[PDB]
Amino acid sequence: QNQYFTVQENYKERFYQIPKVFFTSENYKNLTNDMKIAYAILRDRLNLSIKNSWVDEDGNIYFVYSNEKLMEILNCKKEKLTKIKKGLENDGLLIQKRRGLNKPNILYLMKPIVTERDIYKIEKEENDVEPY
Template structure:
């Protein structure tokens, strides 16, 4: 096709399908740190809602959801799954994408969230800050006053309640952490070292992303991965921080024939 034939005219303007990026993502300062690639992924996911409507993927409150197929979407965007997950995390952190776990053996469902307009952003930010500060203060007091929280497992469990991506994920992550600590004690003959909140959140995020990418949603499968890790000949301290690295998870899950 010649160049002139590819130019738009008034009559042909609506003939081509487009991925639409909301103006708020470009104009609202609260989204200035989101990469352009992540904004394009948002537009693609927003477009996928048409398929959700066709399939009647509505929750009990009438909200549109979809299933995040990491591999198909990475092929469409011509990027790796790890890169796509990085953009996905950007959108989740910006509260433009919401992930909800349905339960063991079922994939997460995702919701595309409307971007904040400039007018609403300040109100939402103030509300969020007030709630976050109150929650942090209450949690700090509870952690300080509860003398029973002096063992690693109890502290981790309480940290998970704060940092887990979704409230309904708590039982899933508690099971994984508890099994890991029990296995660590069995093999190492000592308690697992105390983990800071920063590293617990890092571990939770890595496991959550890995679960979504390779559809490993059963606690029993994660127990197999943990067992495979401790039975390997890796020269390491077996700290959970090391276990939760993407390359380590991939190799152990592959050995278990889960991917």
């Protein structure tokens, strides 16, 4: 029969999205699971950035969160936050622009890179049907 839309189902169907290229592309072999998870969590945060009007002249969405707020968002400690930021920045997934005074740094989450090998690999896995 025609079933209702439940609030339980609605919240079970909320997720953090990690790009598949993080598990196929060998250009992201250095990323740890914590980095992958963090990237996804920050990706989900982009929504709040827009509501906070954190958009520059070019239309790029960024973050103006303090280290303590980031630690709360990523549910991690200072040393882990530092390691995560460096890992993502190292792979061009995050850009940092330190501000003067004691102001929180400006963070720009970036989109991943995709090569032909990644496409090939991703397709092969998504079409890995059982042999008839």
